[PDB]
Design an enzyme around this catalytic site. Structure first.
Site: not given
Lengths: 399, 400
Positions: B250, B134, B215
């Site tokens: 999301k 990321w 994560d």
């Protein structure tokens, strides 16, 4: 391999939080909580403003996406914000010298300001009033910035010691940040006069301080425009400014985390370079701000009818505060307080130092179910016509 | 005279991806397709508010009586729902009270809070992340004064997870380092470790004394809610200590409401509470307390049978559309006569993959065909639809 977390020591206990635990476990029915940090109405509640409910109903009906905002958030929120701060028709706005990032509350703004300064400037030191908002020190220290205190409040005499203040600020170097509360100084409730602000602005230009205005109570003092006088005196004199503003209190949107960090620089070109670095501090933090609360504020401010409803709610809050101040002092006199508490009427916003000792504060909680914090700070929004008499009788008793 | 404090600041370098976005918006060609976007989109090119979210918001509208500050760790029910999602209901880890969760402003907020907390309270000096990872991980950790190192992950030429390389590069990670892993739908390769690989990583982590940070931003987008937590839980079964940064941006389509959490796990209830008391201090020094709306929406949905069912179906729909576009992309590339094999696209999961295209090919796809992708060649398959697929694929074949 030993654990990474094993040797961590517990943070110190949060005394105010413990005090809330205590209040929570106190089953006495006549409790008065003057220790809270929020607005309460005459029924002891912190309600959602009607204007906010309306704005929220509108968003529900019209919102078609929750896709990420830019690092700086909602543009119309930024515009309305700059107008509240600097006034419509401001040369500063016309010159395009200001940029605004929507932030998670005034706290986020302060933190973002600090990181921005620590990483991109020569600022080493931030000056705050003695006393100030309780979280200033931890926010600025977390960014690696030293915190210094200037003289402000004379506790014995309930006054702003302006000469003290001025002289203490002589130690502040060119390039240091000096932080001021825009209005309703938290927690003394004592603000500079316009003239004092004007002296402060001039002195700041002369010494080369970067001013930071913490502006969390616009409309709780005298009114929207009047509460921005100090800020505008600074803005008129300076090439550079930072404003950290909050809508937590004036919109009753505390938990939605609605605020902003406004950079002002010599010209548009300069604020843009500065602001690009502020956006980077944001990206390295929470990446983008929470939409709901900011949309609620943009929705109210840009609609004449909604804004008029909000402005009236805000006036009601400001006036309820002012009249509990008045009621408080009169009810102390009539209960034979003996001591003068007229300073309460000479102060504005939710907070004042009562002047009570920690011994008296302790007795008031244990004996009378009346709760204040150890410094004797009180939130007059915690008073109502209904609880005023028993509250003042307790106070006379500990005097 | 006093020189301005901002006078000499050097502008941050321009965000090339924001540049592409403006470039797109201004593109008048009716054939234009943006595969560079960072969020879910439905078959109509929209990122709508979920129906479960609307219903939940109407309920909040009707029932909320106050906006008064939440505590620093936010909404308790949100905390409990998070921990169940992560560890499973009836988890021994939960029963043992070894986990504390703070609601945060997005997974990003969770990452930043985790970093500030590590830097101030532990000897952690380095965070290891996958190559590639990321894009914002580096900036977040660096900001807290933590060095960021990369381990071997994606084999770009062959479109695989080079597990042997991963293991061996991690030999350099010292006891007490943080090693970060994506829970599922690795961003941006879309290739995740198998359960067996996860178990190997878990065991290795224990032997080397690394602190795992998970994560977890795409739970529900890989195979399903519970399956997507397998790797996280394989780690949770082996470790005394753990940090998870979760996001609901999301899987609830609550991107801009900033809904996420930072969850600490330690050996015992006592240790986790001490650590957690320090994490709260980190929050107080930042944004003070978290935004209520998005988290309250999440808790309202998760704790109501019928709403939760509407939500799970919506998430399934997203997961299946993404899978359908992956398959369709590969079939159509073949239909359009691509030389190369693109079957790795079917073997990957989530919205993101590396297309394998060079920067030269990406530039050409934009200028010549109006097909926008990011410089790295990362594509978002949710930018694909049954209607834009053919020309998109012809364009790609024409640049190979």
């Amino acid at each position: 391999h030993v654990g990474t977390f094993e040797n961590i020591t517990a943070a110190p206990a949060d005394p105010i939080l413990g005090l809330a635990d205590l209040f929570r476990a106190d089953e006495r029915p006549g409790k008065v909580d003057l220790g809270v940090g929020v607005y309460k109405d005459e029924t002891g509640k912190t309600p959602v403003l009607t204007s906010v409910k309306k704005a929220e109903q509108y968003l529900l009906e019209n919102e078609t996406t929750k896709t990420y905002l830019g690092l700086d958030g909602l543009p119309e929120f930024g515009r309305c914000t700059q107008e509240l701060l600097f006034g419509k028709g401001s040369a500063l706005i016309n010159d395009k010298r200001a940029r605004t990032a929507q932030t998670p509350g005034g706290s986020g703004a302060l933190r973002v300001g600090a990181d921005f300064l620590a990483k991109n400037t020569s600022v080493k030191r931030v000056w705050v009033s003695n006393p100030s908002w309780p979280n200033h020190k931890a926010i600025f220290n977390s960014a690696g910035l030293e915190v210094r205190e200037y003289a402000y409040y004379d506790a014995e005499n309930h006054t702003l010691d302006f000469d003290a203040l001025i002289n203490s600020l002589n130690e502040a170097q060119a390039g240091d940040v000096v932080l001021f509360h825009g209005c309703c100084h938290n927690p003394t409730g004592i603000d500079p006069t316009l003239e004092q602000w004007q002296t402060l602005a001039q002195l700041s230009v002369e010494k080369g301080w970067l001013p930071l205005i913490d502006f969390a109570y616009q409309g709780f003092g005298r009114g929207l425009e009047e509460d921005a006088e100090g800020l505008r005196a600074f803005a008129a004199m300076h090439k550079e400014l930072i404003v950290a503003s909050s809508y937590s209190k004036n919109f009753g949107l505390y938990n939605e985390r609605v605020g902003a960090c406004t950079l002002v620089a010599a010209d548009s070109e300069t604020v843009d370079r500065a602001f690009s670095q502020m956006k980077a501090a944001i990206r390295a933090n929470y990446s983008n701000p929470p939409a709901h609360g900011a949309s609620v504020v943009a929705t109210i401010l840009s609609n004449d009818a909604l804004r008029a409803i909000w402005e009236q709610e805000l006036t009601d809050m400001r006036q309820r505060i002012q009249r509990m101040r008045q009621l408080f002092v009169n009810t102390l006199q009539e209960k034979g307080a003996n001591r003068d508490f007229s300073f309460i009427i000479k102060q504005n916003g939710m907070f004042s130092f009562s002047g009570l000792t920690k011994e008296q504060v302790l007795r008031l909680r244990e004996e009378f179910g009346v709760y204040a914090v150890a410094s004797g700070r009180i939130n007059v929004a915690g008073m109502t016509p209904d609880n005023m008499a028993p509250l003042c009788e307790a106070i006379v008793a500990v005097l």
